[PDB]
């Protein structure tokens, strides 16, 4: 019934959620549905959201098991063709939703754009098998996925409390979900555990890898590490998966 659905997970977001809603409602050229999924905010968050009361806004307010649990609740209730996810501290740039609708009007299931973090562009990678040995290739809040994309790929894995977004995009890549990357800015806004989750996601792609080998690949793709052992890993596991070989050949063409 809508062109776009925007899911906004919130908890104690009274300080910015108004700006976020303002950045969405001022988008021209599209019919939009907004689903706010609140984890039971004790502050004014709900009172600010109701100030934007409209027929195309839905408020859920109940306890949940985290950001991706609230995201799953909102995606499940989405009624628009393309679904995006926006945090209360983020904002969409002008005309971004019309761009999404036009690019998706060709049947592409994912439309992703650039992300502005502290006045710098996110160091994006390509949406391709080479990302399966890295992280999420583009900002998650800059991504719009169709109803079909979610229906085929599924919901976010709550086992990953940090990198559930990267894991979902990696499942979309593996499912051959079509993706179009627009070179325009769409959104502006325990590290060892981040590394552990990233390596576990990579292992879910290639279950034959040890954790240290996945970490080596990750750092190699992200320019954080060395690449002298890549040929050793390829010869060792190349027989296991053609997709593993393709990911290594795209990431390290010198090999």
Ligand X SMILES: C[C@@H]1O[C@H](OP(=O)(O)OP(=O)(O)OC[C@H]2O[C@@H](n3cnc4c(=O)[nH]c(N)nc43)[C@H](O)[C@@H]2O)[C@@H](F)[C@H](O)[C@@H]1O
Contacts with ligand X by CB under 6 A lie at: 9-11, 13, 37-39, 64, 66-67, 70, 85, 87-89, 140-141, 165
Strand partners, 57: 34
Stretch (H or E) spanning 116: strand 110-117
Identity of the residue, 194 or 255, whose beta carbon is nearer to ligand X in the bound complex: 194
Identity of the residue, 20 or 247, whose beta carbon is nearer to ligand X in the bound complex: 20
Q: What's the closest the beta carbon of residue 116 comes to ligand X, in angstroms?
A: 14
Identity of the residue, 33 or 38, whose beta carbon is nearer to ligand X in the bound complex: 38
Give 227's DSSP letter: -
Identity of the residue, 16 or 203, whose beta carbon is nearer to ligand X in the bound complex: 16
Q: What's the closest the beta carbon of residue 239 comes to ligand X, in angstroms?
A: 35
Q: What's the closest the beta carbon of residue 118 comes to ligand X, in angstroms?
A: 13
Q: What's the closest the beta carbon of residue 187 comes to ligand X, in angstroms?
A: 9
Which of 233, 239, 191, 190 lies closest to 212 in space, CA to CA?
233
Give 93's DSSP letter: P
Identity of the residue, 74 or 213, whose beta carbon is nearer to ligand X in the bound complex: 74
The Cα 57–Cα 226 span in angstroms is 49
Q: What's the closest the beta carbon of residue 238 comes to ligand X, in angstroms?
A: 33
The Cα 49–Cα 250 span in angstroms is 45
The Cα 92–Cα 149 span in angstroms is 22
Number of neighbouring beta carbons within 10 Å of residue 167 = 23
**What's the distance, CA 36 to chain centroid?**
17
């Amino acid at each position: 019934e809508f062109d776009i659905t925007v899911v906004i997970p919130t908890f104690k977001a009274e300080k910015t959620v108004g700006q976020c809603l303002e950045s969405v409602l001022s988008q021209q050229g599209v019919s939009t549905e907004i689903i706010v999924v609140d984890g039971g905010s004790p502050d004014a968050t709900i009172s600010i959201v109701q100030s934007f009361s409209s027929t195309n806004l839905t408020i859920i307010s109940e306890p949940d098991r985290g950001i991706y649990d609230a995201i799953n609740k909102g995606v499940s209730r989405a009624q628009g063709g393309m679904i995006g996810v926006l945090g209360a501290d983020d904002v969409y740039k002008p005309n971004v939703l019309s761009v999404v609708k036009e690019n998706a009007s060709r049947g592409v299931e994912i439309v992703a754009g650039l992300t502005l973090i502290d006045g710098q562009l996110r160091a994006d990678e390509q949406y391709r098998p080479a990302a399966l040995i890295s992280g999420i290739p583009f900002g998650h809040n800059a991504m719009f996925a169709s109803q079909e994309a979610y229906r085929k790929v599924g919901l976010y894995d709550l086992a990953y409390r940090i990198c559930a977004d990267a894991e979902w995009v990696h499942r979309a890549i593996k499912s051959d979900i079509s993706c179009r990357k627009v070179e325009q800015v769409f959104v502006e806004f325990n590290p060892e555990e981040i590394i552990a989750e990233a390596c576990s996601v990579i292992q879910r792609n290639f279950p034959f890898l040890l954790k240290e080998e996945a970490k080596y690949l990750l750092y190699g793709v992200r320019g954080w590490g060395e690449t002298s052992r890549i040929e050793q890993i390829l010869r060792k596991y190349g027989h296991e998966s053609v997709l593993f070989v393709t990911a290594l050949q795209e990431a390290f063409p010198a090999v």
